């Protein structure tokens, strides 16, 4: 929080279906279970981890990439759930600022 109390749990989701194993209670095929797993694990493999599947030994690399996006986000998106003022990046001065207003006056 703004008062530094924990108030929400953000849990981020992805798919490790293709990278673990196929297991079916019943299926038309083991190939069909593999097809369902590839249709599930889409947002990592088909989109983000596209430099992986040409190369081999990509399981740890793709898992590290998908978790490292969220691991950099673990410091970046600490959005803290506060009704705070929106800020520009620094070395960019505000329009209605008091210093900028007296600068425009001088």
């Amino acid at each position: 929080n703004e008062q530094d109390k924990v108030v929400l749990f953000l849990c981020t989701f992805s798919d490790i279906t293709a990278f673990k194993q196929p297991i079916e209670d019943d299926s038309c095929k083991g190939w069909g279970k593999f097809a369902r797993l590839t249709r599930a694990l889409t947002s990592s493999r088909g989109v983000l981890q596209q430099l992986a599947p040409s190369v081999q030994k990509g399981e740890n690399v793709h898992k590290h990439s998908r978790l490292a996006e969220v691991l950099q986000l673990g410091s970046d998106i600490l959005p803290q759930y506060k009704q705070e003022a929106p800020k520009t990046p620094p070395h960019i001065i505000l329009h209605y600022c008091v210093f900028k207003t007296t600068w425009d006056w001088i």
Binding site: A35, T38, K57
Partner: protein
Amino acid sequence: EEQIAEFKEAFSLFDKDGDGTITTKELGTVMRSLGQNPTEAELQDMINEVDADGNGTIDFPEFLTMMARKMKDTDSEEEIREAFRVFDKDGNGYISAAELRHVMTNLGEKLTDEEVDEMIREADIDGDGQVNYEEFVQMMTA
């Protein structure tokens, strides 16, 4: 059905060259990056058990058969979809009143033009002469 074109991104993500030809080497590479190490023998068994052509290379409508196999919809959903397939002969996602006239002739129960137009209009909600899958189930509900 409608996700058939939504699988096309996955199918272009399957092959490495993007040739419409599912290579055995490309499949071994993508399983090796998946984290499994299968032999090429069992992958060739999967090719001969999957492909309808069966020549070391398969296509996207050649995978549409396996997609229709692994579809396996519900009872009433498959019932209304098969009723859509017999009830719309063109399969264009719409029911013309002339299409309902043709299936009224092919049903055996022939109806008048006013009664068949009233069936269309009671079925239709947006009012463009054709009804939708949702407009079909809207009267097939109760």
